[PDB]
Amino acid sequence: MDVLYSLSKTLKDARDKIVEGTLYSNVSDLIQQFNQMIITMNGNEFQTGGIGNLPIRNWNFDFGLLGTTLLNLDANYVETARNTIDYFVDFVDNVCMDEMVRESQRNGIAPQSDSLRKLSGIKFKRINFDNSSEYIENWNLQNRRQRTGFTFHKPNIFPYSASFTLNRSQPAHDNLMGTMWLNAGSEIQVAGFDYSCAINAPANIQQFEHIVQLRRVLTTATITLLPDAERFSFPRVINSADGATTWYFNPVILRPNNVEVEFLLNGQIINTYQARFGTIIARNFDTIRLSFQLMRPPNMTPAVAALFPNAQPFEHHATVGLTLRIESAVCESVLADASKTMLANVTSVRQEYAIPVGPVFPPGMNWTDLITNYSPSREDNLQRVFTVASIRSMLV
Amino acid sequence: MDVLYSLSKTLKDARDKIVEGTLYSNVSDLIQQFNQMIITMNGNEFQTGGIGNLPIRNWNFDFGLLGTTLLNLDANYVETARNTIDYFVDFVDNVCMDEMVRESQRNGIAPQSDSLRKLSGIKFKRINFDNSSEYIENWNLQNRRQRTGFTFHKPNIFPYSASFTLNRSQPAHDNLMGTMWLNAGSEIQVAGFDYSCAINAPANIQQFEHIVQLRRVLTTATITLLPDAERFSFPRVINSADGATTWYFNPVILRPNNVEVEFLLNGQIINTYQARFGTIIARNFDTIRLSFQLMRPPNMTPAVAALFPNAQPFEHHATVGLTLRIESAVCESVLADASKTMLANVTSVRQEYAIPVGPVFPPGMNWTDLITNYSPSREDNLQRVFTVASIRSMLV
Amino acid sequence: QNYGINLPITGSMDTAYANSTQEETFLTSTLCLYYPTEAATEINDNSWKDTLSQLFLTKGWPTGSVYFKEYTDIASFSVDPQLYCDYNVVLMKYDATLQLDMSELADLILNEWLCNPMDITLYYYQQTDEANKWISMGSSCTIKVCPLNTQTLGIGCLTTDTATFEEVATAEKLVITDVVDGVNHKLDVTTATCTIRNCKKLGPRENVAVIQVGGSDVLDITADPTTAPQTERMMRINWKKWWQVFYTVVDYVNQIIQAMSKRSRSLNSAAFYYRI
Amino acid sequence: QNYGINLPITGSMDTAYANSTQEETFLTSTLCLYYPTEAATEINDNSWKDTLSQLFLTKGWPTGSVYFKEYTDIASFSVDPQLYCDYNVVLMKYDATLQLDMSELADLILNEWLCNPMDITLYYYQQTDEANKWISMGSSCTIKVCPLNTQTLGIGCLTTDTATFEEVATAEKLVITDVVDGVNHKLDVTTATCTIRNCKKLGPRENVAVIQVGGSDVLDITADPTTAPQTERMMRINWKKWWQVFYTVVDYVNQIIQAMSKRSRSLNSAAFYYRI
Numbered sequence A, B: 001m002d003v004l005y006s007l008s009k010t011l012k013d014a015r016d017k018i019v020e021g022t023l024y025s026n027v028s029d030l031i032q033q034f035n036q037m038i039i040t041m042n043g044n045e046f047q048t049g050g051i052g053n054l055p056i057r058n059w060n061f062d063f064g065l066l067g068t069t070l071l072n073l074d075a076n077y078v079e080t081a082r083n084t085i086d087y088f089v090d091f092v093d094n095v096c097m098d099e100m101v102r103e104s105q106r107n108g109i110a111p112q113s114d115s116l117r118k119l120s121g122i123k124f125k126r127i128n129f130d131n132s133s134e135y136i137e138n139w140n141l142q143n144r145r146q147r148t149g150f151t152f153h154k155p156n157i158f159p160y161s162a163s164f165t166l167n168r169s170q171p172a173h174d175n176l177m178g179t180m181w182l183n184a185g186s187e188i189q190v191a192g193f194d195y196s197c198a199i200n201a202p203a204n205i206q207q208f209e210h211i212v213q214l215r216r217v218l219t220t221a222t223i224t225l226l227p228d229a230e231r232f233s234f235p236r237v238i239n240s241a242d243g244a245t246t247w248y249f250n251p252v253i254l255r256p257n258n259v260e261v262e263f264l265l266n267g268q269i270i271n272t273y274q275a276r277f278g279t280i281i282a283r284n285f286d287t288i289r290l291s292f293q294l295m296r297p298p299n300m301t302p303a304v305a306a307l308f309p310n311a312q313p314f315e316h317h318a319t320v321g322l323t324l325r326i327e328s329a330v331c332e333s334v335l336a337d338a339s340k341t342m343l344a345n346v347t348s349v350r351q352e353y354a355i356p357v358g359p360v361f362p363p364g365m366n367w368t369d370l371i372t373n374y375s376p377s378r379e380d381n382l383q384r385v386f387t388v389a390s391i392r393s394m395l396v
Numbered sequence C, D: 001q002n003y004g005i006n007l008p009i010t011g012s013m014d015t016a017y018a019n020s021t022q023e024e025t026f027l028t029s030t031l032c033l034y035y036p037t038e039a040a041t042e043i044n045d046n047s048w049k050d051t052l053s054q055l056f057l058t059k060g061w062p063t064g065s066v067y068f069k070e071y072t073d074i075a076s077f078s079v080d081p082q083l084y085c086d087y088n089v090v091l092m093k094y095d096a097t098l099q100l101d102m103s104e105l106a107d108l109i110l111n112e113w114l115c116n117p118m119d120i121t122l123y124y125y126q127q128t129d130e131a132n133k134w135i136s137m138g139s140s141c142t143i144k145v146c147p148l149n150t151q152t153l154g155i156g157c158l159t160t161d162t163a164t165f166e167e168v169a170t171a172e173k174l175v176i177t178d179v180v181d182g183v184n185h186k187l188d189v190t191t192a193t194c195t196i197r198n199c200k201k202l203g204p205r206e207n208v209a210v211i212q213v214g215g216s217d218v219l220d221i222t223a224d225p226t227t228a229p230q231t232e233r234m235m236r237i238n239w240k241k242w243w244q245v246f247y248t249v250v251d252y253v254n255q256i257i258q259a260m261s262k263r264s265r266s267l268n269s270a271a272f273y274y275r276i
């Protein structure tokens, strides 16, 4: 991996720095690195694989070194370098593609393609140099089992799930008490609905609790917590849990009462925020417990009093919302996020060459299925293919 | 850890090989290793034991080297070696005990005691040599993030749980349909009981399902599957779920029908056995889904026909069973089992010196509570203390 | 159930809809149509019940599933009404004079009640909360009330002299008395021809539908003056002939049943739950 | 709260037993005792009800919680046994000539029945399954049966001529008719004098225990000939005085109540299943 990254890094640096007119002192170290790459790769044969529709490609390296005598680079020097760079870039792109479309259940962190296995030999370790990208840095750190961290803007941590729980129900579905939620991506919209508006509840308070278990621990997470859930504030016709029938939902939004968001790690409470909504920090947690109460307003104007009768029929159902958006966090495991393209790149390469479904990942690299069942083997394979995708995106 | 293991291994070799009359050629390499150990440890001060009732011990090393000039070892040589070995064995035992009684939430894999921290220094790495035990080999592989493997006979993967689920029940508990199970250690005994004997069930079949989610993935597992659950095959008076009343269970055992044992990984069927009993192999799984059926006998003798009336009262309750024993398996994580003594060693040491409950392990090193909530921090601390206990048992 | 009634039920908002359960519901259900005597008198056919049963069969109901029960009038029907089938549709003729009795009958049959016996001759009774009412049924129910105070002496009435009692009901078949809550009352009722029960309105009864034949919306199944809930089970039609009324009931039986929820039928046929 | 749906309940086999709830149930529950008239006749004591109430109070039942209901005889009581207390104990005198009726009475109140109306002369009726019976009740139940074939022609009976109908019941206060299943039967009943209902035996009734006084084991609450289930709610006692019988009932009331359980169909948990 470090060798493949070093090849790609050398090629990117050569593309950016070997330019017409530049001082040779600007590229001296780069030229020495590039010539070392040429010498190491010369005389070697590689085969990038025929898995799926990815075509079998053979690579042979017999290149001359780049010159070292110029004071400034000229057009001829740049074009001569560009020919070799283009061949090397094509080879690295094909190696990355071959690796990305492969998985194993035993050593998913180990190389899976023939070319990357060959590059793991000692003779290619001379190519290795500056490993400064986030993914390669994390790769080297976790190879030594040092504490790693991936920074994610809007981490796609929550598997998609639009569900509801009914604590009070009956076949008519006209006096219902419960919660409905969407946990999608980096957002949780939850809403507790009481159809009676806690008319007969003790103290006229209806307590709602929503627990979300993250499949991986998040640290240094910045989160927005808005009082209302705009997703569950309009009339809906909702299937029943068994799908037998539908029920009507006609929310009227009351501000949630005694809002308490707890962030927990291994069942211990790490962070707790009460009646706070701007922007909160969860420093280290794997579970989010949201408590919110529907408090019947003791005083009502005639319209409000009309909306909430003493007994059935209940036609305007008191709903208290909550919206939690993890804007940024840090995870020791690779995750899909809103900014990075690693997941999209891996999925695109697997779809373009019609890669048969493997024993590790769900078909189509579906992220909901993956993050729902984020096992250590899946984590290893995913980190491998994501690091390879970043290496590829350095060039393509 | 490698240095502590090397010390222990050198001492065990010295105890077993430095014996009167033996050819020096039998011990030459060991004598070199032992002298290296003495040279490295000479002039170093260690302190062990300040937690619980573990006494404070100070350790000073000023020892002479063992001779190299003899042809066969004699009494003098053995006595000098034995004195040095006794001191070193005492020191290693105390260091192991000092490490076994400590835990950390953050870096529980890293050394905790001061002596092991000192031994992690470069000036002790010369002591390191043959790391052949499964626990130290797994430790080294885990350091490099290679696939680890622990072989277990009768692994204690299931936390103890004797519970039941009633799918049909009434306050009098006389027409009950449901399941009762014991998941203990390496055994799962599950029984589905129908009091009506599926008189009114569609097609005269009652379906029973039981899902056990293992906390760690198991590979290369040998499983005995037997048709009957003898634990749930005798008359029994059982507390109700809330414990407000007791109900009666008078089982009559019918053989289970359409027995399907699935071993799942990430919710996908890896292994599946349909009406197969005796020894089966589950190559890689984290879940066991046992689905069986009570099929009402289409033909009955007068005794059998009398057991099961057309309606209540039901005095004989038709029960189908299943027993699943994991004889041997492989896990990437340390686990207690029937043959090893690592858990017993750690628990005994923590009990003898009255080690206060820590932030990682449950009180008393309760294995059920430990494997129920087997968190990564718990796993790291447990691998550390189990490796130390295996190192200790080499000498103590 | 009872060991799991207080347990949550979780459903996903993408579970596919099952097919229509209307045909199966009709195949496994019983229908009870309640009509007044004047309906049968005006139809003047001896095979009209068979005609309705066959038409329902064209509408999916099995043959012996739709039953017909006749009552003399609203006041008579209100004496121990007995709802028999899974679905009970009551064709109630409208009268500008029987408005309160229509409302009381609709209240008694469109809501579930938990009732306990009262001993007016011994104890003084009060209505605890806004759902606590008194329901009196009999051939002739006359109910008179004497409100009391914390010292048990009556206000505007004398316990010894019944004549001073503030009468609330006279010559009634069904009456729903609602007195001020928290005040002990002494009651005089015609115990010979009237039974009064302390009842609590538990909730709606969803397997009883009331089609008001003619008239306007006058039903008031709620004691609270500020609310007059018109629900899916309170239909109203305009009529000239009873045959057209029954044709409308048969044709839109899909809509009528769809407006009612099954599983509300009790083991007993009474309109109230009697607990000692 | 989640009424009308069945959820699995999970319990651990080591949950601690709660304390005895017998005292609380006695405090908060009512016990109706049903005895024949001749028992009160032979007792002769006007204040016997108060004496038995005080004895129950010594057994822990609050004063006024235990009710003493009287019935003339088995046949008359069987017309419509309506049991409304939390716990019902029916004292039934044994008679060799009335055996079946005794069984019928037991089979009527030791089991729960879901009964739909039957309209003979307008529908042919089948008994679908083992649990589908026809319960006829009234002053005099005389029921005659004509089994039809697939062509609707009666078998050994002429539909036009009722006199040829096979006869199953004659002048009965209560009768449980079980006919061959899968056969349509025309029914002739004294409708003006007896009402017949198509009933399904849902399951046992647990709040009613019948104590049979004198005699032997004769009750048969199941129509299947091969079963005579003697449940724990069917007791038997030898006697020479009714006072000794009542003293035995009071003394061993703990055992009687233990053999009984709160009516499952009733109470909040069984809401929107059938009743309450």
Ligand SMILES: *[C@@H]1O[C@H](CO)[C@@H](O)[C@H](O)[C@H]1NC(C)=O
Residues within 6 Å of the ligand: C019
């Ligand atoms: C439901 O309806 C669909 C479409 O009409 C049909 O294919 C299917 O067989 C029906 N039955 C069930 C049980 O889904």
Ligand SMILES: *[C@@H]1O[C@H](CO)[C@@H](O)[C@H](O)[C@H]1NC(C)=O
Residues within 6 Å of the ligand: D019
């Ligand atoms: C239960 O019984 C025990 C033992 O007599 C007693 O200590 C306790 O107070 C009782 N009540 C409860 C609610 O536990």
Ligand SMILES: [Ca+2]
Residues within 6 Å of the ligand: C100, C101, C104, C172, C173, C174, C175, C176
């Ligand atoms: Ca009235």
Ligand SMILES: [Ca+2]
Residues within 6 Å of the ligand: C156, C157, C164, C165, C166
């Ligand atoms: Ca007055």
Ligand SMILES: [Ca+2]
Residues within 6 Å of the ligand: C127, C129, C130, C132, C133, C178, C179, C180, C181
């Ligand atoms: Ca009132």
Ligand SMILES: [Ca+2]
Residues within 6 Å of the ligand: C220, C221, C222, C223, C224, C225, C226, C227, C228
């Ligand atoms: Ca009103």
Ligand SMILES: [Ca+2]
Residues within 6 Å of the ligand: D100, D101, D104, D172, D173, D174, D175
């Ligand atoms: Ca009889």
Ligand SMILES: [Ca+2]
Residues within 6 Å of the ligand: D156, D157, D158, D164, D165, D166
């Ligand atoms: Ca005949």
Ligand SMILES: [Ca+2]
Residues within 6 Å of the ligand: D127, D128, D129, D130, D132, D178, D179, D180, D181
């Ligand atoms: Ca039959």
Ligand SMILES: [Ca+2]
Residues within 6 Å of the ligand: D220, D221, D222, D223, D224, D225, D226, D227, D228
């Ligand atoms: Ca029998």
Ligand SMILES: [Zn+2]
Residues within 6 Å of the ligand: A169, A173, A239, A240, A241, A247
């Ligand atoms: Zn629902």
Ligand SMILES: [Zn+2]
Residues within 6 Å of the ligand: B153, B154, B338
């Ligand atoms: Zn063994």
Ligand SMILES: [Zn+2]
Residues within 6 Å of the ligand: B166, B169, B173, B240, B241, B247, C003
């Ligand atoms: Zn139970």
